[PDB]
Design an enzyme around this catalytic site. Structure first.
Site, PDB file in Angstrom:
ATOM      1  N   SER A 145      58.196  12.925  14.754  1.00 22.95           N
ATOM      2  CA  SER A 145      58.088  11.850  14.506  1.00 22.95           C
ATOM      3  C   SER A 145      59.409  11.051  13.734  1.00 22.95           C
ATOM      4  CB  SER A 145      56.811  11.517  13.826  1.00 22.95           C
ATOM      5  OG  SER A 145      56.796  10.138  13.430  1.00 22.95           O
ATOM      6  N   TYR A 158      52.089  13.581   5.872  1.00 23.40           N
ATOM      7  CA  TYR A 158      52.067  13.320   7.390  1.00 23.40           C
ATOM      8  C   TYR A 158      53.552  13.712   7.647  1.00 23.40           C
ATOM      9  CZ  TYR A 158      52.476  11.556  11.877  1.00 23.40           C
ATOM     10  OH  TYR A 158      52.942  11.342  13.315  1.00 23.40           O
ATOM     11  N   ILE A 191      54.479   4.097  19.486  1.00 23.41           N
ATOM     12  CA  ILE A 191      53.880   3.985  20.822  1.00 23.41           C
ATOM     13  C   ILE A 191      52.520   3.578  20.842  1.00 23.41           C
ATOM     14  CG2 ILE A 191      53.567   5.440  22.914  1.00 23.41           C
ATOM     15  CD1 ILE A 191      56.436   5.405  22.341  1.00 23.41           C
ATOM     16  N   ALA A 192      52.127   2.463  21.849  1.00 25.47           N
ATOM     17  CA  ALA A 192      50.916   1.961  21.963  1.00 25.47           C
ATOM     18  C   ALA A 192      49.681   2.938  22.321  1.00 25.47           C
ATOM     19  CB  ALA A 192      50.947   0.636  22.894  1.00 25.47           C
ATOM     20  N   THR A 193      49.137   3.801  21.262  1.00 27.88           N
ATOM     21  CA  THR A 193      48.174   4.674  21.682  1.00 27.88           C
ATOM     22  C   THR A 193      46.890   4.019  21.001  1.00 27.88           C
ATOM     23  OG1 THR A 193      48.336   5.997  19.543  1.00 27.88           O
ATOM     24  CG2 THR A 193      49.834   6.243  21.642  1.00 27.88           C
ATOM     25  N   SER A 194      46.019   4.981  20.830  1.00 27.64           N
ATOM     26  CA  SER A 194      44.514   4.568  20.179  1.00 27.64           C
ATOM     27  C   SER A 194      44.835   4.967  18.742  1.00 27.64           C
ATOM     28  CB  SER A 194      43.369   5.682  20.766  1.00 27.64           C
ATOM     29  OG  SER A 194      43.986   6.982  20.440  1.00 27.64           O
ATOM     30  N   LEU A 195      45.610   5.724  18.344  1.00 25.69           N
ATOM     31  CA  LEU A 195      45.996   5.957  16.896  1.00 25.69           C
ATOM     32  C   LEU A 195      46.705   4.802  16.185  1.00 25.69           C
ATOM     33  CD1 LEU A 195      48.009   8.779  15.120  1.00 25.69           C
ATOM     34  CD2 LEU A 195      48.717   6.512  15.306  1.00 25.69           C
TER      35      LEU A 195
HETATM   36  N1  LIG Z   1      51.769   6.410  18.700  1.00 19.95           N
HETATM   37  C1  LIG Z   1      52.239   6.583  17.580  1.00 19.95           C
HETATM   38  O1  LIG Z   1      52.073   5.478  17.084  1.00 19.95           O
HETATM   39  C2  LIG Z   1      52.862   7.963  17.055  1.00 19.95           C
HETATM   40  C3  LIG Z   1      52.418   9.031  17.267  1.00 19.95           C
HETATM   41  N2  LIG Z   1      53.152  10.300  16.930  1.00 19.95           N
HETATM   42  C4  LIG Z   1      52.813  11.757  16.909  1.00 19.95           C
HETATM   43  O2  LIG Z   1      52.385  11.668  18.600  1.00 19.95           O
HETATM   44  C5  LIG Z   1      51.153  12.617  18.622  1.00 19.95           C
HETATM   45  C6  LIG Z   1      50.195  12.092  19.413  1.00 19.95           C
HETATM   46  O3  LIG Z   1      49.925  10.986  18.898  1.00 19.95           O
HETATM   47  P1  LIG Z   1      48.807   9.839  19.704  1.00 19.95           P
HETATM   48  O4  LIG Z   1      48.874  10.032  21.263  1.00 19.95           O
HETATM   49  O5  LIG Z   1      48.989   8.594  19.269  1.00 19.95           O
HETATM   50  O6  LIG Z   1      47.524  10.196  19.108  1.00 19.95           O
HETATM   51  P2  LIG Z   1      45.847  10.183  19.541  1.00 19.95           P
HETATM   52  O7  LIG Z   1      45.058   9.926  18.404  1.00 19.95           O
HETATM   53  O8  LIG Z   1      45.865   8.877  20.685  1.00 19.95           O
HETATM   54  O9  LIG Z   1      45.682  11.375  20.231  1.00 19.95           O
HETATM   55  C7  LIG Z   1      45.530  12.640  19.612  1.00 19.95           C
HETATM   56  C8  LIG Z   1      45.262  13.625  20.786  1.00 19.95           C
HETATM   57  O10 LIG Z   1      45.166  14.932  19.960  1.00 19.95           O
HETATM   58  C9  LIG Z   1      44.013  15.904  20.034  1.00 19.95           C
HETATM   59  N3  LIG Z   1      43.699  16.319  18.588  1.00 19.95           N
HETATM   60  C10 LIG Z   1      43.758  15.849  17.375  1.00 19.95           C
HETATM   61  N4  LIG Z   1      43.373  16.998  16.576  1.00 19.95           N
HETATM   62  C11 LIG Z   1      43.071  17.880  17.515  1.00 19.95           C
HETATM   63  C12 LIG Z   1      42.424  19.108  17.237  1.00 19.95           C
HETATM   64  N5  LIG Z   1      42.356  19.402  16.034  1.00 19.95           N
HETATM   65  N6  LIG Z   1      42.182  19.921  18.126  1.00 19.95           N
HETATM   66  C13 LIG Z   1      42.279  19.704  19.462  1.00 19.95           C
HETATM   67  N7  LIG Z   1      42.649  18.328  19.846  1.00 19.95           N
HETATM   68  C14 LIG Z   1      43.138  17.488  18.842  1.00 19.95           C
HETATM   69  C15 LIG Z   1      43.037  14.534  20.122  1.00 19.95           C
HETATM   70  O11 LIG Z   1      41.635  14.587  20.494  1.00 19.95           O
HETATM   71  P3  LIG Z   1      40.310  14.546  19.727  1.00 19.95           P
HETATM   72  O12 LIG Z   1      40.301  13.291  18.923  1.00 19.95           O
HETATM   73  O13 LIG Z   1      39.353  14.574  20.488  1.00 19.95           O
HETATM   74  O14 LIG Z   1      40.098  15.895  19.044  1.00 19.95           O
HETATM   75  C16 LIG Z   1      43.732  13.540  21.029  1.00 19.95           C
HETATM   76  O15 LIG Z   1      43.498  13.763  22.442  1.00 19.95           O
HETATM   77  C17 LIG Z   1      50.848  13.319  17.406  1.00 19.95           C
HETATM   78  O16 LIG Z   1      51.756  14.670  16.939  1.00 19.95           O
HETATM   79  C18 LIG Z   1      51.374  12.198  16.225  1.00 19.95           C
HETATM   80  O17 LIG Z   1      51.528  12.724  15.196  1.00 19.95           O
HETATM   81  C19 LIG Z   1      54.469  10.080  16.084  1.00 19.95           C
HETATM   82  C20 LIG Z   1      55.189   8.966  16.052  1.00 19.95           C
HETATM   83  C21 LIG Z   1      54.446   7.829  16.675  1.00 19.95           C
END
Ligand SMILES: NC(=O)C1=CN([C@@H]2O[C@H](COP(=O)(O)OP(=O)(O)OC[C@H]3O[C@@H](n4cnc5c(N)ncnc54)[C@H](OP(=O)(O)O)[C@@H]3O)[C@@H](O)[C@H]2O)C=CC1
Ligand SMILES: NC(=O)C1=CN([C@@H]2O[C@H](COP(=O)(O)OP(=O)(O)OC[C@H]3O[C@@H](n4cnc5c(N)ncnc54)[C@H](OP(=O)(O)O)[C@@H]3O)[C@@H](O)[C@H]2O)C=CC1
Lengths: 259, 259
Positions: A145, A158, A191-195
């Site tokens: 990130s 983080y 990135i436009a995600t759920s987070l």
């Molecule tokens: N979009 C953004 O704004 C940015 C995101 N990132 C990084 O990108 C990566 C993905 O982010 P993003 O796609 O937005 O996240 P989301 O919250 O949209 O999705 C994260 C995914 O990881 C899974 N996950 C989380 N914890 C676990 C766990 N303990 N065991 C198994 N699966 C797990 C979740 O499933 P579940 O919830 O069902 O466990 C989910 O499918 C991360 O590492 C984040 O730190 C970095 C910069 C920007």
């Protein structure tokens, strides 16, 4: 596999039920890769497979809690067998955020985030190693990130977990060089995600986030697919000379100072 | 304190019985500050107090295992009482290294390095926040390392703890700015300390170090008093505009590529 496709390669993507992980699984599967993913929820994973398989993707998934070391070693055994001991790609995407100030974290908050974001990525990394080797052409990608290199509100710990991730990457590149594995990191900007949407729910997190977008060159959020593309390319055999690099897909955020 | 001295300022320096730490205690005390240090050995600490007090340095020390949450709160409680709730300087100097490849590291090993290298530093900075704030002119300095940014043999995990620490330095400098606290890091190169004497005992490691030293412009190990001089400057009121930086004292090691 061909120069610009992963036709026939086996891949394992963590956290693929939504967001970037979901885009990475679709991008890789659509280029020829056979994929295996995991999330903490089965119903969700199953609905994913339903959509993915209607597109002819070769994919399999299973419930795993990456904060549980034992569960992590269970997943590798399962994937190892699934691909018959040959894994070409490991995409460490799973990650969680805790929006608090550095001094407001509890031992529980810190312990939870360091084990899912770093330790877990590091652990699977090491577990997959022999299978990545036996593939004769392994690839490891860590989803870092921008906050792992620069200060952003509420992401000190983080950011600490990703900053540690970034370094393991550089080292692992040299330590596994002789094992035919290339290790690279991909740093998303916004990135436009759920987070993100869960973030903007907050009228202050929403205000912080519009500051980041206004600081990009493109002045907008990326798409999971624009990010998944970088990951995909790094795994193509056309990137044989790229290793130990941390590349950012941030629409220009990294390069900005006073624009 | 005058602009170029630390006259009157109080400081806590973790791990001041040997190497860089021992040198930092001398430079701060020598510049007029009141220091408090710690190590895991009473006897050692007692010879130091004798050495330092003999030279007229105001200084106190107590034993403490930084790899222990409770002992850490114990030490901050004592520091805070010794200094009457005012702390100007906090130098997080303590650290250890376990020279193994990433895949060979045991869980016990991982727990050890992470806890002492990044946990205690992070945790101590927090417990100190109120005393640094109360002090009205705070300064936190984290001793990082070049291995926290570049791959070095057997420092994949050591280098991750430092990479994490560096990112925490940049965010704190932003989170604590309003509290009038400045946060910086100093990444040593190869410094002639007890940590290094131990290392160069093994032929292969002796060979690796020689590679490093051979790679800096000055082609020689730095001295503890050379690393300490940069820590002391950043605490000077003269460096009131320097915050959120990671500065390397490495004889040019971080600028080299093909020399
Ligand atoms: N979009 C953004 O704004 C940015 C995101 N990132 C990084 O990108 C990566 C993905 O982010 P993003 O796609 O937005 O996240 P989301 O919250 O949209 O999705 C994260 C995914 O990881 C899974 N996950 C989380 N914890 C676990 C766990 N303990 N065991 C198994 N699966 C797990 C979740 O499933 P579940 O919830 O069902 O466990 C989910 O499918 C991360 O590492 C984040 O730190 C970095 C910069 C920007
Ligand atoms: N020497 C070099 O070339 C380099 C050193 N560094 C960094 O410099 C700093 C100091 O290193 P250096 O002086 O060389 O090392 P030394 O081993 O010479 O000194 C380390 C000091 O930290 C103390 N310490 C270690 N663990 C603990 C603990 N758990 N609790 C309390 N005190 C502890 C040690 O005391 P004791 O063992 O008696 O408990 C000792 O006083 C570290 O942060 C290290 O990571 C970074 C790059 C290069």
């Amino acid at each position: 596999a061909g120069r610009w496709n992963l036709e026939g390669c086996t891949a394992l993507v963590t956290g693929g039920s939504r967001g970037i992980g979901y885009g990475i699984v679709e991008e890789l599967a659509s280029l020829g890769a056979s994929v295996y993913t995991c999330s903490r929820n089965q119903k969700e994973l199953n609905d994913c497979l339903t959509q993915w398989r209607s597109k002819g993707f070769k994919v399999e998934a299973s419930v795993c809690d990456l904060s549980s070391r034992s569960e992590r070693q269970e997943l590798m055994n399962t994937v190892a067998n699934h691909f018959h001991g040959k894994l070409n790609i490991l995409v460490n995407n799973a990650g969680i955020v805790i929006y608090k100030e550095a001094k407001d974290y509890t031992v529980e908050d810190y312990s939870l985030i360091m084990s899912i974001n770093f330790e877990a990525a590091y652990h699977l990394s090491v577990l997959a190693h022999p299978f990545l080797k036996a593939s004769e052409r392994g690839n490891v990608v860590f989803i870092s990130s921008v906050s792992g290199a620069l200060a952003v509100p509420y992401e000190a710990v983080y950011g600490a977990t990703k900053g540690a991730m970034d370094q393991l990457t550089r080292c692992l590149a040299f330590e596994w060089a002789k094992d035919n594995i290339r290790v690279n990191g991909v740093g998303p900007g916004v990135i436009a995600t759920s987070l993100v949407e869960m973030t903007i729910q907050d009228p202050e997190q929403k205000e912080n986030l519009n500051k980041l977008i206004d600081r990009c060159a493109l002045r907008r959020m990326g798409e999971p697919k624009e990010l998944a593309a970088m990951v995909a390319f790094l795994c193509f055999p056309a990137a044989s000379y790229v290793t130990g690099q941390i590349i950012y897909v941030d629409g220009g955020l990294m390069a900005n100072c006073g624009f």
